[PDB]
């Protein structure tokens, strides 16, 4: 594979490498953005969980996971993909919802059949409450609610870690009506629902953002390794290069000397 071939390699590898880094920075920048943006959200979403945090719910019975639209980031997908399915046997009203598609693309195998809806774009457009509401909204209209809903998302923790986290989504007012939850409110299975609602969006937003944050750092990370990887490989080729490089010459010189010791 002449030097040429090799150059095809090299050339592109530089590019890749370069790209990785470029893209890295790019990613990292986004990642930074997500981080800041995560702040109010943290509060807010932690807020979302308020009630629930102050209140256990149950059902004998919306399993949904949260992923990014795209890969080329960590094992975000893998996790969720995994852990939704990991669940999925246990429960009645088995039905799944996937937000993002790097879960649609892995959890699709038979989730081609067990998804309820699936949502496209997540990252590559930073998440918003606005959005959160959207996906939330139609989600409601559907006779799937809780089989006990759970929400699977990537809880960012640090650039070194995120945890695909999950919470359960009580998508029923009703048992919230029941229980001691009865008097955690002391004010209507109406507004309940309109909180059940709202918190689904809040969390959705939240989740979305965590997910993406986690992702963005993972992509950033991802770009880091790769580009290093790239670097060593270049090096290896470079030997192969010269060597062969000379080899040519050599062979050729050979051919010269020989052909000059053996011309007509």
């Amino acid at each position: 594979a002449t030097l040429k071939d090799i150059t095809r390699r090299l050339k592109s590898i530089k590019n890749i490498q370069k790209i990785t880094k470029s893209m890295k920075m790019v990613a990292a920048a986004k990642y930074a953005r997500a981080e800041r943006e995560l702040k109010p959200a943290r509060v807010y979403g932690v807020g979302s969980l308020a009630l629930y945090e102050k209140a256990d719910i149950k059902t004998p019975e919306l399993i949904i996971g949260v992923s990014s639209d795209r890969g080329l980031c960590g094992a975000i997908h893998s996790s969720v993909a995994k852990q939704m399915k990991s669940e999925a046997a246990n429960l009645k009203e088995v039905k799944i919802i996937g937000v993002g598609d790097k879960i649609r693309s892995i959890l699709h195998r038979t989730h081609s059949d067990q998804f309820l809806v699936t949502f496209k774009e997540v990252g590559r457009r930073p998440p918003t409450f606005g959005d959160a509401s959207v996906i939330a909204l139609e989600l409601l209209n559907s006779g799937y609610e809780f089989d006990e809903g759970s929400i699977i998302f990537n809880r960012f923790r640090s650039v070194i870690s995120y945890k695909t986290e999950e919470k359960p989504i009580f998508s029923l007012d009703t048992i919230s009506s029941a229980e001691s939850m009865s008097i955690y409110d002391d004010i209507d299975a109406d507004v309940l629902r309109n909180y059940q609602e709202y918190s689904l969006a809040n969390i959705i937003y939240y989740s979305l953002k965590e997910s993406t944050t986690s992702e963005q750092s993972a992509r950033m990370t991802a770009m880091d390794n790769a580009s290093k990887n790239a670097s060593e490989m270049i090096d290896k080729l470079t030997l192969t290069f010269n060597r062969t490089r000379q080899a040519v010459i050599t062979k050729e010189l050979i051919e010269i000397i020989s052909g000059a010791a053996a011309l007509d």
């Binding site: 370069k18 790209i19 470029s22 893209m23 920075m25 790019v26 990613a27 920048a29 986004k30 010459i249 050729e252 010189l253 010269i256 000059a260």
Partner: protein, 255 residues
């Protein structure tokens, strides 16, 4: 002869590469051991010996010169080639041209990054120098950040500027075939860009500007142009004058 007649001559050797072949051929026919790639040993020496004869003399000779433009033509994606190697060591910088930019339409299409004048400033005008130092710089970083031409949106504005600016400058170094210029004009157009008036403008209009502007200054600021032609530097007066011209012109041009 010119050189010794104080005079300055320009020889374009277009090209030693083909010569080398011929010579090699000649050598070989001479049944002589040639060298690398079957090419002779002294094809450098020959030429070194030739090329050293292209020079700028002392004053004793009327200071004369023979300015040499040897050509060695890119080896279709290579220049590692022997003769280039040689020549690389010989010439007083080298102008790497790459097609691609040409193909981009970016004409001229130089591989500037590699291009070198091992000289530089003695071969300059302050006018140019005053800006050119900076220009070089602007390109340098720009090249560095051109690295990440893909986007840079997702990164900082400064550098986004540098990219835009850079791209703009590119337009400034662009030139058509049968389109050479003279110096004041050249600096003139650079000034605009270097004063970043055109960042708002897009590359297409740079060119557009430039002509128009050029023809404009030619008209009005012909006054000024006489002076600049004179001045060898850029003059404070001229700067302002230029600027004002430019700003106004610019304003019209963009409008």
């Amino acid at each position: 002869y010119f050189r010794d007649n104080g005079k300055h001559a320009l020889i374009i050797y277009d090209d030693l590469s083909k010569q080398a072949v011929a010579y090699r051929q000649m050598s070989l026919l001479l049944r002589r051991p040639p060298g690398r790639e079957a090419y002779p040993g002294d094809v450098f020496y020959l030429h070194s010996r030739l090329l050293e004869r292209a020079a700028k003399m002392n004053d004793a000779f009327g200071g004369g010169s023979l300015t040499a433009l040897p050509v060695i033509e890119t080896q279709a994606g290579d220049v590692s080639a022997y003769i280039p190697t040689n020549v690389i060591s010989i010439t007083d910088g080298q102008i790497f041209l790459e097609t691609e930019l040409f193909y981009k339409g970016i004409r001229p299409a130089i591989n500037v990054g590699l291009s070198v004048s091992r000289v530089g400033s003695a071969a300059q005008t302050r006018a140019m120098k005053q800006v050119a130092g900076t220009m070089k710089l602007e390109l340098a970083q720009y090249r560095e950040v051109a690295a990440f031409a893909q986007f840079g949106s997702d990164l900082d504005a400064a550098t986004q500027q540098l990219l835009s600016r850079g791209v703009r400058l590119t337009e400034l170094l662009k030139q058509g075939q049968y389109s050479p210029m003279a110096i004041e004009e050249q600096v003139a157009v650079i000034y605009a860009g270097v004063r970043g008036y055109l960042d708002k403008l897009e590359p297409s209009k740079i060119t557009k500007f430039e002509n128009a502007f050029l023809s404009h200054v030619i008209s009005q600021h012909q006054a000024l142009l006489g002076k600049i032609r004179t001045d060898g530097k850029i003059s404070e007066e001229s700067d302002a004058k230029l600027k004002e011209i430019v700003t106004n012109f610019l304003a019209g041009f963009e409008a």
